Design an enzyme around this catalytic site. Structure first.
Site, short mmCIF file in Angstrom:
data_model
loop_
_atom_site.label_atom_id
_atom_site.label_comp_id
_atom_site.label_asym_id
_atom_site.label_seq_id
_atom_site.Cartn_x
_atom_site.Cartn_y
_atom_site.Cartn_z
N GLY A 28 -14.50 -5.77 5.37
CA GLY A 28 -15.47 -6.45 6.20
C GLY A 28 -15.76 -7.87 5.79
O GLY A 28 -16.65 -8.49 6.38
N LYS B 167 0.80 -1.22 0.00
CA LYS B 167 0.00 0.00 0.00
C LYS B 167 0.83 1.26 0.00
O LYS B 167 1.89 1.32 0.59
CB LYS B 167 -0.94 0.01 1.20
N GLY C 16 -11.54 -2.98 9.01
CA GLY C 16 -11.40 -3.26 10.42
C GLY C 16 -12.69 -3.23 11.24
O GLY C 16 -12.67 -2.91 12.42
N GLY D 72 -8.59 -9.32 5.45
CA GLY D 72 -7.61 -8.67 6.30
C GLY D 72 -7.04 -9.50 7.45
O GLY D 72 -7.38 -10.66 7.61
N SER D 73 -6.17 -8.89 8.24
CA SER D 73 -5.49 -9.54 9.36
C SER D 73 -6.43 -10.31 10.26
O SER D 73 -6.01 -11.16 11.04
CB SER D 73 -4.74 -8.50 10.21
N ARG E 178 -23.48 -2.50 -4.92
CA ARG E 178 -24.78 -2.07 -5.35
C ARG E 178 -24.77 -0.67 -5.99
O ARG E 178 -25.58 -0.38 -6.89
CB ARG E 178 -25.75 -2.11 -4.17
#
Lengths: 321, 315, 321, 321, 321, 321
Positions: free
Chosen positions: B256, B86, B158, B277-278, B170
């Protein structure tokens, strides 16, 4: 064509029919098979599979999702009465998983953390039957059109306070009595308003695109349906309700039902039944509380009996104002 | 001149081509060589490198920059699959560094702390390919025009909440179907709308100068392009989109995605793949859960399988 | 008049001349002699003397003034490279004490608690060269008219977040390109705009005195000049800027530079050089982290070098997002 | 009476005569006999007796009153230089007590807790001379009119920040240059504006009584004076200030003077002297701070001396906001 | 038919009759059998039964429900004076149980968490007599049209503050005095006003339905009656009041009575008797404080006795601000 | 007709005469016998019986009522000087107990928790004399019409800040002077204004009844009086005030008297005497401070004496600002 009508109809009736056999009863929320047992032993016509109570964590800062699959399996095993499981509003994968798992009924539930901010699950595409919450007639009819096979009040979960449930019941009933005083063209007005929520995504995209937020005649709004096509279908559902004088599906009270009296009250308001979750487990002999609830529903018109059922039953939860 | 076009087309296609290789898989966030190993073993198609979790840094209210070089290199030296990294929005130099370090794809990311309040990187200048976020079709097209090779949703990082990814999918999807119901004239207008954001700098300056906030015809606004010029280019992109009925670049869900269930949902909404993610590495059994996500993305259209995938105990 | 026009033309060429003598390198912030020593060993073209960190006094709720002369001494008596010091905005007496104290250039800085709500120091009456901050062209032109020898971006001090620096460079750079595209009638208008802040004290007084807030033709406003007389000078400073397509003085970047990638970025945006501050203090490895910044400014167009320079360093100041 | 105007004028001259005795030096706030002697030995022209530092009383939720009589008496008996003391705004009994106690000057202070919401003390009646603060020319003039022998900036008490003093000086000076570019007719209008605050009590009582808030031409508003009569007196004072180009009375800075440079700054602004309170005894090495400030006032136009004077004087006060 | 019609218009007159028994006395909130005795022995004409205090429950944000049937039973078993219980507003079921349990009077109390957000219980359908709280005349007349046998002020519970009871009393009386001054046509319009609150649900539902919020001549609003039907009934009740110059049922004070003086004050204002709840609670020497309040009511127009009544009484019960 | 109003003017005057007795004196708030005894020893012309010094029950978020009769008897028997006591505003019952108890004066006091939200006690019906507070002439004249024998400024209780007392003294004073400059007709218009607050309950009731808020010439508004009758009586008291040049009753200062100088200030304003309470006992050394306030009221015009009186008097209550 001539089929898909007598087929979709037969499929709709089938689903609604399922829900019928739980009528006149109490559906209880259980967290473990231990509880699921007490519940069946108490008289629950069904159970509602949960792992943690959705009402706190998420609501201590979390995300409440579908209960873990094995934890649900365990509950279906422990009991012979039907077993239900919640999913997140709009979460089609969860729902399917719950259906492959073989649950009897799926709750598309506002108490879980919503997963689609525009749209509920198109339930007419599933075989498992669904129950959905409604705060007012518009909600009930939208959920029904979407394919809901059963309707409960949203009420006020985690608080043990009956007020919101009563509001929803009244809002739904007064809106029905109003529909009955109405001409067919007036009712179609209500159908237009009741169909406005489906526009929400189209309108956001209009504004993102710099266009005016207005309805377009031929434009698919939800699952291939035009706005007019949704109005029309809702209209028909509204005439059906005009004729019946109640919802065309099984309709339960949910949220804050904390005592035999609470349970009796919803029945008196013409409900077909009662969901209760927190209320029961808690107290110093809940098996009695659970049993009390079951009995209050059977004998809701007999005051002298409700007074008996009430005698020493435990300690109802500390709610929230 | 005409060889210039042929070049721009060939380089685009070369960049977009790289993204196609991760199509249909799970890209995983990793904070060390051990984790990047767990991911490759689990079936990840690529991994995203970080040192500390940006979501964490900014709950504590820190500045989030690109991960430390030596740390990116530890992850590259652990795996055979593509490594991503990133950089902060607009941080040209962080990105030239990552490209020279030899990472496979650069994520110009909105969870890091933005470095430019007006403009993103002009990705076209880079030989390394970029992935960018989008909340709606307007953002996505702006990023594509700037040269993104790949789009993902911004989502809500997160939280474990899928809702914000779904909103963005959407928002993009409906906007495309809208485009397909339009005349070429009507589309030009949307283009005019999607280029508006490039005017923020010019308009701020005009306020500082006691001038009125108006567009000017030949006023270069971004990387040499005037507003009308950007509208033209964006219009072309909108036309390509109308033909395809989808974005012209690989398009992934992110933000998410916390359960096999979630992973399946996004694939059912037409996404080409999933970022996770982590989160995966907190919890009883990180491999396995990682394998559960990868498999969910491979079996999203069959509930019986997802249901078994979910049923994992953990012990 | 005759010899008058040449005096400050030559007086300013002379002050600006000093600045040209650091363009192209880094200037570090040092709170002692042991840090001023470490800094010279990294290539710093100059240093800025500090007792305590203004940012830290400000976060503390306190007043940040010019540093203790003794602390400034212990610094100018530690290195060979030029030494600079901060004074509070408007604090003419603090600046004199620094000029008299010898220091190479005064930073009239907004990180220090401002001492005048209306006016900045008229720097033209000084011998020491000045650096002032600017957040946009209007601010830079105003500082330059007041006699600043060198302009830097304000950025956001103490955050380690380079974004404010970037904003201020883009605001200045774009405002200049806009100028290059304007007719002289039109630039005069920008001039009128740019001189308005000088009217603040006059307008507050008119208000206190029961009068209308407006400009009059012969109201001396600041250090002798009327509004009109400021307009014309600024206007001339504008035309000069049109001809060069940049500022008539050295122009650095301050506030937020926390890494060599950050320094690289500012050079690539056309900055004469870079200011960095105490991010090197807690580095965690200062002598190293300081060399990286210096190299990065030296080879800013060389991504492969920047990659190596970034190879290792401590944890470089968490920042405030 | 012609003769009565000459008592007014003659008594007034004598009072101003005392203020002129402290012109050019530094007046220190002191809380006990020990600081009194430190102040005198350091070179003060006067000390200002207070109990607690107020605003320390006000950091606390406290009410700040005139200092205890035993304390003021302990201070008068510790030094030879003039002793000053504070009373609350409008507290006529406090000021008489101070006068009876033997103080050389009374400071009707905004930093104590005001005891009158409408009016200050009519100081002409007194035999002891008063000093008053002012934020702007409007205020200075009003305090002068009411009988102040001396005026100081209000600034911002107990913060250590010089900006509010610099604000009030610049407001007063700019307002003076404004008068000077004006006609006697214009100036008259400013006097009317400058007398509006004596109407505060009259208008309030109007509103309580149901009448419109208007001026009546023979309505006595303060100490028997009518609005018009006050505008007249104020108007003459303004003409006087027009000609003089300064206030007709001794004029000191006060509020936030925390370092020798602060003191130098105020003098460079044409102030007559300096009050300093917290700045000295909230610092770490009071005796040294105190002399440095005193010497700063004496050599304010000599930067080389200000620099040596600033070497090693201790850590200034924090301070605030 | 005509017999049920007859015996029904006479059970209303009958229930009001019951209330007359408690006139001129004191009603006390009790929480166990022990307390019931202390309160009969002290001279309560009636006791009010709880398990816990609703106030305490709600100052702590929980849900205040009907007391347990056990606790109510034990209390009823401990005294011969009429025993009362509270139910939640709108809770049809909680009431039917209390009635079917033997209680002499039901309090539809606002201090329990309300159960219906639109309507109160239709008390006319009940056999037991109901007491209801009122804040003003319109509220009192509404609870009377619904069938309340006795009215109390709402005052403010758990505060020991008498000022809300007093306001409600004054609001009522002044409204009656005002009725007595109107022609019958004006009283009709008041009655139109007093009936509006019954339109809440209808109006909410019309908004949900997308229709203008308006009254509709022929639509049932509450328990079969239309708005017009209610307006007429409420008009007839105002007319009976215009002639009695009083409320047509027994009328007590409630909430914030805490000392003999308060009890006496309420009798002086025209009340029939007093409720006391928290007052006696936790009072040093319960029996004494109890008799004291009773004796106060008996001798409220005899100050010399009041005085000796208060002489060394164990209290004073602190309450919120 | 007017053979009936002379018994009245008789008892009213008899009442006023009693307050004439405490004039030129200090009334001190006491909480037990030892304190009472100190008060009499220092030279108080009266004590006020208290159970919790001003604003303490306020500060504990409590309800402040009349003090225990057994604690008021304690005090009445410990001194020889008149003992006063406090009752809640509008609490007739509390007052009748106090009168029956033999107290010399009742303070219907705004520092106790008001008991009536609309009306003060109609004091004419009492035999015992009343003291009432006042913030301005309007409030004074109302309290007087209702039958107050003496008036005190309200100020602010238990803050130690004299400023609110001064506001009130000056609002009344200025209002009295404005009256004296007025044509009898104008005065009538003021009396219309001062009468308005008695419309408060009426207007309330009108709003609840759907009626426009209007004054109707014949409606009894307070204790049998129409609004216009009230306007008439207040007009009369105004005209008396025009002749006297002051209030027709003894007028004291109260609220925020914390020091001997504060007390002297109020005497120098025209006040008759001083209520003090907190000022003395919330003070490091009461008895000495007590004698000082007294001495200060007896020598309010002798500055030399106030100074000696102020020596070694102890630390005053800290106050709230």
């Amino acid at each position: 064509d001539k089929l898909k009508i007598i087929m979709e109809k037969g499929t709709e009736r089938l689903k609604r029919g399922f829900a019928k056999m739980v009528k006149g009863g109490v559906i209880m929320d259980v967290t473990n098979a231990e509880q699921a047992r007490i519940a069946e032993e108490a008289g629950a016509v069904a159970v509602m599979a949960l792992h943690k109570v959705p009402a706190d964590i998420r609501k201590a800062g979390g995300v409440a999702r579908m209960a873990p699959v094995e934890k649900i399996q365990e509950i279906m095993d422990a009991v012979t009465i039907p077993v239900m499981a919640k999913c997140r509003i709009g979460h089609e994968a969860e729902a399917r998983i719950l259906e492959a798992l073989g649950v009897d009924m799926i709750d598309e539930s506002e108490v879980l953390t919503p997963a689609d901010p525009f749209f509920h699950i198109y339930k007419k595409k599933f075989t498992a039957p669904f129950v959905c919450g409604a705060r007012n007639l518009g909600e009930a009819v939208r959920r029904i059109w979407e394919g809901a096979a059963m309707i409960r009040t949203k009420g006020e979960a985690g608080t043990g306070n009956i007020i919101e449930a009563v509001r929803h019941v009244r809002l739904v009933n007064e809106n029905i009595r109003l529909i009955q005083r109405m001409t067919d063209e007036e009712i179609y007005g209500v159908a237009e308003k009741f169909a406005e929520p489906y526009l929400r995504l189209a309108f956001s995209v209009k504004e993102i695109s710099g266009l005016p937020k207005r309805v377009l005649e031929n434009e698919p709004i939800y699952e291939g349906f035009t706005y007019r096509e949704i109005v029309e279908d809702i209209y028909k559902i509204l005439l059906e309700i005009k004729k019946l004088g109640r919802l065309p599906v099984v309709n339960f009270a949910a949220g804050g039902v904390a005592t035999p009296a609470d349970a009796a009250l919803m029945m008196a308001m013409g409900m077909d039944g009662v969901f209760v979750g927190s209320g029961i487990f808690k107290s110093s002999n809940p098996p009695k509380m659970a049993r009390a609830i079951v009995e209050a529903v059977n004998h809701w018109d007999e005051p002298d009996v409700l007074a008996e059922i009430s005698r020493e039953i435990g300690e109802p939860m500390r709610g929230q104002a």
